[PDB]
Symmetry: D2
Subunit: 498 residues, 4 copies
C-alpha cells in the first residue's frame, strides 16, 4: 500500500466498526439537519440571519489561526519517555534523576529557526530540539538546539539577529546584506556560522541530529553543593546529513520531509532514542577556565570535560492532533524543578523572561492549562486566579491570599534556590571582544577534514557572494582572522563568482 502518514483517514475509519457516525452538531450541541445547504427564502432568495448553523460554523472557521512562533515556527512533535540509566545524584537532587530505571514522560518538538509556517523542512538552518519532562516537581523544559553553541553572547542582540535572518521590512524577501551585514559586524558569530555552513548545516530529518542544552546549567545536590553543567543528548541513530543537492530536491518535492519521516518511524515501530550526557565543571575550574565558562559561543572541551551518561530519550507516540499537541506546545526555560538552576549566562538570563512572555501572547494568559502544557504529574496549588479562558475549577473557593490563617497552600523551604555570591558594579559589560576565534580555529583545523573544509568554504561563499562587496570584504577579514586559509579559500571562490 503506502506509508502510514498517508493511510491515516483510512485507519481512523477502519478503527470504528462500532460505527454509525455521530450526529453532526453545532458547538452548543444542537443537532443539524442539513449542513450542505444554507437557509434562504426561496431557492434563489437571500440568506437568513436565522441560519445560526452557518454563522456558528463560519464564525469558528474565521478564528482558527493563532500567531505562529516568533522563531522556530515550523516543526514536528511526539511523545515518549526519559529513563534513568546511571546516577548523578551526587551532582543533582532532582526527582527526574532520582533512581536508575526511573521513567518520566516527555514531549519533543523539532523545528527549523527562520522559515514561517509553510517553509521547507530541509533547509540549512540550526534546528530546535525541545524536550518537556513531566516530573513530580513540575515540568522541566530543556529548550535545546542541535548545536552546542550559538551566534551571540548577549540577549539584547537577539531581536536584531533574528530580524536579519528573516525578511526585508520593505521587500519581504530574504536579504544577504542583512544576513552578512550582521554576522560580519559581529564576529563572535564565526563559531556557529562555521558549524552552520558545514555538513551538519542540514540534517537528514530529525532522527539523525544531536540535541544540546547549549547553555551552562547549575546542578545542586541534596547537600547544597553546586556544580555547573552542560547537557548533550546524542542520536542513537547516528549523524546523517543531506547533501545540498538532495536538499533542494526535497524542499520542492516534500516541504514536510522531516514531519513525514518522524511520523513514519514511530508509526512503524522504529523509535528514535538519544543518550543524554552531562559535562560537569566545579565552581573552581570555572574560576580558571581560560574563557568565560558562561559564553554561548564556547564549548567545554571533552578531554578536559568528558561526558557522563544520564539516561535515555525514546520517542514512541505520534500526536493524534497536531494543532492541539504540537502547535500549542509551549516550552519555557524557566521551568526548572529543584536541583537544576540557571547560570549567569547572559543568553540564558533573557530566555528566562522571553518564553513565557510570548506564550501569553500567542496562546494566552493561561496557556499552562492546555492539556499538553499542564504539569499533570504534579499538583498545582497557588494564589494565582482568574484570567481569560480559565479552564480548571480556578481552584474553587480556597483562600486566594498569602499568608492566611485557613490552610491554603504553603511554601516549602527545601526548594530555596542555591546561595551564591556576587560583587560588582551595576553596569553593562562589553563581551564583543571576548575571544572570537580560538575554538573556531581548532574546529576548522582538527574537527573537520579537508573535504569538509573545501565544502564548508563553497557553501559559505555560495551564499556570501550575493552581499555587496564591502560586506564580503569585512566577512572575509573575520574569516581570515580565524585562519588565513579559511579567509583566502573563501576569497578565491568569491572572486570567481563576482
Amino acid at each position: 500500500n503506502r506509508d502510514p502518514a498517508s493511510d491515516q483517514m483510512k485507519h481512523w475509519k477502519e478503527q470504528r466498526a462500532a460505527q454509525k457516525p455521530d450526529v453532526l452538531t453545532t458547538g452548543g450541541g444542537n443537532p443539524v439537519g442539513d449542513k450542505l445547504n444554507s437557509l434562504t427564502v426561496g431557492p434563489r432568495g437571500p440568506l437568513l440571519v436565522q441560519d445560526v448553523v452557518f454563522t456558528d460554523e463560519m464564525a469558528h472557521f474565521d478564528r482558527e489561526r493563532i500567531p505562529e512562533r516568533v522563531v522556530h515556527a515550523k516543526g514536528a512533535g511526539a511523545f515518549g519517555y526519559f529513563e534513568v540509566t546511571h546516577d548523578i545524584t551526587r551532582y543533582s537532587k532532582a526527582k527526574v534523576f532520582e533512581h536508575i530505571g526511573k521513567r518520566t514522560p516527555i514531549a519533543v518538538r523539532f523545528s527549523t529557526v527562520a522559515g514561517e509556517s509553510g517553509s521547507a523542512d530541509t533547509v540549512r538552518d540550526p534546528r530546535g530540539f525541545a524536550v518537556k519532562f513531566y516530573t513530580e516537581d513540575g515540568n522541566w523544559d530543556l529548550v535545546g538546539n542541535n548545536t552546542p553553541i550559538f551566534f551571540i553572547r548577549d540577549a539584547l542582540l537577539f531581536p536584531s539577529f533574528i530580524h536579519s535572518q528573516k525578511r526585508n521590512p520593505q521587500t519581504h524577501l530574504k536579504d544577504p546584506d542583512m544576513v552578512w551585514d550582521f554576522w560580519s559586524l559581529r564576529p563572535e558569530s564565526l563559531h556557529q556560522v562555521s558549524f552552520l555552513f558545514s555538513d551538519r548545516g542540514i540534517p537528514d530529518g530529525h532522527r539523525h541530529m544531536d540535541g544540546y542544552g547549549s547553555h551552562t546549567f547549575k546542578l545542586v545536590n541534596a547537600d547544597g553543593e553546586a556544580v555547573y553543567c552542560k547537557f548533550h543528548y546524542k542520536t542513537d541513530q547516528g549523524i546523517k546529513n543531506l547533501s545540498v543537492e538532495d536538499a533542494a530536491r526535497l524542499a520542492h518535492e516534500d516541504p514536510d520531509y522531516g514531519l513525514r519521516d518522524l511520523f513514519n518511524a514511530i508509526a512503524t515501530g522504529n523509535y528514535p532514542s538519544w543518550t543524554l550526557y552531562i559535562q560537569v565543571m566545579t565552581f573552581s575550574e570555572a574560576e580558571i577556565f581560560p574563557f568565560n565558562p558562561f559564553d554561548l559561543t564556547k564549548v567545554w572541551p571533552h578531554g578536559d570535560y568528558p561526558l557522563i551518561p544520564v539516561g535515555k530519550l525514546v520517542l514512541n507516540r505520534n500526536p493524534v492532533n497536531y494543532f492541539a499537541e504540537v502547535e500549542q506546545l509551549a516550552f519555557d526555560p524557566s521551568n526548572m524543578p529543584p536541583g537544576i538552576e540557571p547560570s549567569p549566562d547572559k543568553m540564558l538570563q533573557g530566555r528566562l523572561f522571553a518564553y513565557p512572555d510570548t506564550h501569553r501572547h500567542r496562546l494566552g494568559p493561561n496557556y499552562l492549562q492546555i492539556p499538553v502544557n499542564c504539569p499533570y504529574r504534579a499538583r498545582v496549588a497557588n494564589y494565582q486566579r482568574d484570567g481569560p479562558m480559565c479552564m480548571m475549577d480556578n481552584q474553587g473557593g480556597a483562600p486566594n491570599y498569602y499568608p492566611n490563617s485557613f490552610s491554603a497552600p504553603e511554601h516549602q523551604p527545601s526548594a530555596l534556590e542555591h546561595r551564591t555570591h556576587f560583587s560588582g558594579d551595576v553596569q553593562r559589560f562589553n563581551s564583543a571582544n571576548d575571544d572570537n576565534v580560538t575554538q573556531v580555529r581548532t574546529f576548522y583545523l582538527k574537527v573537520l577534514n579537508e573535504e569538509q573544509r573545501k565544502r564548508l568554504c563553497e557553501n559559505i561563499a555560495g551564499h556570501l557572494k550575493d552581499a555587496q562587496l564591502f560586506i564580503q570584504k569585512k566577512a572575509v577579514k573575520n574569516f581570515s582572522d580565524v585562519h588565513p586559509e579559511y579567509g583566502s579559500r573563501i576569497q578565491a571562490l568569491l572572486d570567481k563568482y563576482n
Copy 2:
C-alpha cells in the same frame, strides 16, 4: 455566628481535617521555597531576573481581568434543575419537555442592565434572569428579563438605547438629557418606561421577581405543526419590591445585597423556585391579532391567551468559584434545540447574532469549552477545528471535511427547521408608528391602582426633572398621549421641581 456568605473561608477550612496544606507551586508545577521575599543581590540590592517565581505570579496577576459584559455586567448566578410537571408535547417535540417528571440541569445569572461591575444591586433598572438548560439536544439558553416587554422593536436602535442609559462620552457621568432625549424621541418606549418607574422598578433581591422570555418563540411538535409562544416563569416566593428609600440605603450599605441574599437562601436550604408557563398563539390568531404579535413592546393579554403550566425551576447550588462559573457563563439565544425556534421578531433576530458575537470577544473564540458553557449532557461532533485556547482533544484525527467517505459525523434530517412561507419586498419597514399607547393606557388604568399611579408619577418626574425643559416638554406630550392625567399628573410635579 453570622450569615453563611460570611463564614466562607471558615468553612473551606473546617472542611479539611485531612489538612497539611498543599505545596505552593509556580504554574509549571515547580515548588516554591519563599513566596514572601523576592530574590536580590544582598539584602538591599536589586531584583534578579532569575526570580522566575515573582514574574510567574505577577505575570498572572496583571492578566486576571477580561472585559465585563457590554450590558448586564453585574450579577449573581447559581445552579439547580428544571422539572417537567405537565405535558406540552402537543406543542413541542423538545426533549427537555419530553415526559412529566423529567429533570434537566440548569444554571441562572441574575443581573441589572446599565451599571458596570462595581455598581449597586438595588437600583431601578430592568433585571436579567437568564436560564441555560443542559438538554440532550444540546444547550437551550432562554435569555430573559424580569419584564415581558422592552423599550424598542428594532435591534438597530439598541446600541443607541444603551449608549444613552450609560454615561456621557465626555463627562463619564450619567446624563438625563441622553436618557430623556432618547425615550421622548422614541415613544414606543412608553410601555416599559411605565413598567420601569413603577414599584417593580426595583425588586427586593432576585428571588422576588418573575422571569419572562419576552419574545415570541415558535414551538414545533413531532408532526411539523407549529404555533407561537411566550414563556413566563413566575416566582414561587411572591413579588416584593424595595421602596426607593430602602434602596438608597442598601445601595450604600450593601452594594451586593442581591448576591448576598441569593447566596444565603440556597446556603441555608431555602431554595427559590419559579413556575414556567407558556401562552400559545396559533398561526391564524397571529394573522388576526390586532397588533404585530412579534412586537416586543407588546404583551398577549391573558384572558385571550391564558397561561399553560410547563414545569418548575429550582435553584439549589451556589457557585464554588464566581469568576469561573458566573463571570464566564455565556448565554446565547440561538442555542435552541429542535422543537423551539425563533419568530420574525426584529429584536430576536438580532440577538441571534449579537450574543455569540461578543462571547468570542470577551471570553474567546472557543468559549463553549469553558466547563460551564459546555453542552455536557450531549455529544459535540462537527468539522470545526483549531482556534485559540483549544482545550479538548480537538476531536483527534477525525476527518475534518464534509462530506467524506470515512464515517465522520453526519447531519440528521429530523432536525430540519420548520417550513414557513414569506413573500415581500426586501426593504426596511418603519415600526415607529406601530401602536405606542393602547396597552400602555390599559396598564395605567386597570393594572395599577391609585397609590401606584401617584407613585409611578413621582418616580418618573423625580428623574425627568433633570433634563432640559424641551426634553421635558416632549416627554410629557408622549405621556399625555397615553392618558391625559398621566401627562398632567407629571407636569404638575415637574412644575413644582423646576
Copy 3:
C-alpha cells in the same frame, strides 16, 4: 549592479545625506546608552530587572506576529489608481464611475490560496487578486480571484473545502484522499478543477493573470433601475503561465518569485495595468438564463453577454513597509458604496459576513483605523464608540445615541438599498444537482485545444494518482460524465501510474 528588490537598504541610506542617525530610543521615547550589552552585576553576574531596555525591546519582539489569513495567507501588494475611460452611469450611480477620466486611489494584494506564510509562490492554486478603492462614498472592496468561477455554490461547504485543501489534522501533511475525497463527492467542482489543472493553473507571476469579480453584483443607476453584472479586469501584459517544470525549480530557487517580480516591475517604472469590463444582465434575461444566473460554478457566455469597458487599473507604487501595508490590509466584500449591491448568490451572501468576522479576530475590533484600511477619501461619522486599540479621537464628545436632538450625524435616504421582491418558503434548497457539466463540457471541447487537453489530463492524473483507488474510481466517473474522453484519457494515465 542588481535588481532593485536587492538594493533596498542601499537606497534607504543613499537617500539620507541629511544623515547623522537618529537617537535609538525605547518605545516611551527614552534614549538608550548601550543596546548591545545587558545590565548585570559584575561582568559575569546576573541580569537586573532594572534593564527596562532589554524588556521593552524583548517584550515587543515576543509580540510581533498576528494570526495569518485563514486562506490566502501568502501574497504581495501595491498601490496605484483606477481611472474611468467609458461611462456606465446608465447602469450605475456610483461615484467611482461618475465621469470619464476620474481617478480613484486603489491598493491590491495578490496571493495564493492554501499555503501558509512561508510557502512557494509558484504553485498550482487559484490566485487572489483583491482591489480596494478609496471612493468618496467610502471604500469599495472587490475581493476577486483570477478565475471567473469557483468550486462550490454554497458557503456552508467552504470550511470543508478549505480543510481538505490544507493538511491532515493528525499528520500535518497535505493529503490527496482529502483533496480527491471532497472533489469527487461534490462534482459541482469540475468546472474549476478543470480551470485549475490547465495551463492557467500557475501564472508567470501576478502581472500575467486576469482578475475576475466572479460573483454577480447588482448595479443600480440614479433612477432606481437595477441590472445584474460581472466584473472582468484583464491583464494589459497578456497571459503567461509557467510550465510545471519551471515552477518546481522556482519553488525552491525563489519561493517569493511573484513578490520579487511585482516589486521590480513597479520599481523600474514598468507599471502593470488591467482593463476593467462589466457584462450586464437585465432582471428579465435573468428570469430566462437557462441556469441559475447566481451560481458561482457558472459563467455568462460572452456571445450572449459581451463585455463593456469601464476604466483601467494601474499599479505604480510599492509598499514602504510590508507588515503595515500588505500584511495588515483587510478587504471586506460588504464594502459596497451606493450603486453596487450584492445578489442572491449563496457564496456572496456568506462572504458578506465572513470577512469582517475574521478581521476582528486577526487584526482587531478596530482594524478599520489601520491607516491603509481607513476610508480616507470619505468622512466617517456614526454612533460606534470605544473598543480596543481605539486610535482616532473616538469622535470626541459628540452625541453617541441615535436619534438625538443635538446635530449629530444623520442618515441619508438617497443611500437606501434597491427594492426587490422575494416570495418563498424558509427552507434549505439543494443546489448539488444544478447542472454540473455543460459549461464544463464546452470548456473542454471548444475553449482548449488538443495539446492542452492532453496536458490538463496528465496534470490532473499526476496528482489524482496518489488517492486510494475508490476515490480515483469516483473521480473518473465524474470526469466521464463531462465528456467520455475526459474520463478515459485520465483512466489511461492513472492505469499506467498505478
Copy 4:
C-alpha cells in the same frame, strides 16, 4: 442653568452653527439610508444577512469593552503643564528640569484602588495620583499615590494584598476576614493602615489631597553624581476630607462625585495646582539612616530631610473623550528619562515590570501609539517592528537590525545608567522584621491630635468588628505593639460592638 458637566451635549451643539449634520456612515465610510429600521423580507419577515449596516454597527457594539485596570479601575483624568520654578540641576540633568520657567505638558489620572468600574468615588481607600510628563527625553511617568508610604515592602506580597482587599472567590463579596486576616498577619502594614483609617482616609474630591512619589528615586546630575530622592506634590487648594457621614450620602447620591468635581473646576476656570518638592539623601546619609532608606513603609523625616521646591503642576484641560484619553492612558514607572533612575526599593523593582506587563494585555502589544500614550514631544527610532494593531508607518523601510552599516538609529552614551556597586549573596532576604512601629508610634502621638486619635480608633474598629475574634485578637496585639492606648482604645470599642 446647571453645572457644565451637565450642559455638555448642549455645548457640543451650540458650538456648531456651521451645522448640517454629517452623513451617518458605516465604518468603511459607506453612507446609510435608514439606521432606525433593519432590512427584512416583508414588514414582518426575517432579517437579511445583507443588512451589513446592522452587523457593522452591532459588531462594533459587542466589542466596546477592554479589561478594566487590575487595581485603580475607577478614576478621573485631565491635562495641564508642569512648570519649573527653582533649579535642581545640581541634583538632576533631566531636561524636564533644565531651566526655570520651563513648561512640559502633563496628563493626570486620579482613581481609587479596590473598587471596579462602577464603584463610588467617595470611599475610604488610598488614592492614585498619576502624572505623565511629555519630555524631550521621552515620557517620564511618576505613578504616585496620595500617600508617602504603603502597606508592604516586597512586591511578592502584592497580588495577595490586593486579592484580600477585593472580593471572596466564592461569594464575590468583600470579606473582613480577608482584609483583617492579611493585615494582622503582616504588621509592616500598620503604618499605612494608620494613615488610611484617619481623616485623610477619604479626601473631599481629588483637588484636596497631596500626591507623593512614595518610593525613593535616584537623581543623577550632569557629572555622574547621584543622590536619592523623594517627590512630594502638595495641594495648593489645601487638605479637605469628607466626614464618613458625608461620604455615605454621596456614595449613593453621586457615585462619581470626584469626576463631576474635577470636570467642573477646570470647566469654570478653577484650575488645581500642586507644588512639587524633593527631599534629597546623599549616598552616605543613606548608609547611616537608622532604617532601610528604601523601605516603602517608611518616610524620611522633614527636620532631617527638609523639602526643596521644584516647580508647579497645573490642571487646565478636561478630556474631550473619556474612553480615549482617560480609560486608555497607560502609566509605566519604568518611563524614566536620563537623570531619574530607580533605587533598590523592592516594591519599585517589581513595578518596573508589572505596568508595561498589563498594558500589553489590557490595551495591546502596541499601546504606546495610542495618541495619549505617545511620547509626542520626542522622536522614537528603534529596531522594534510589527505586532498587532500597528498604527504608525512601522518606521518604513529602515534597517531593522542592530548594528548595521546603513545609518539606522544609534545608541547614545550620554544616556548610560549610573555606576553603583553591589556585593552579596543571591538569596531572598526577610524584611518582615524590619521595624514595624516606630514611625507608626510617632505618627499616632505627635502627628495627630486627640480628636483624631479618638476618630482613627472608631473608624478602625468600625470595620475590624466584623472579622472573627481570633483576627481581632491578633489585629489588636499589633496595635498594642505600636502604643498600648492605640491597642486598648480599640479593644474598648470592639468589646462594645461584639
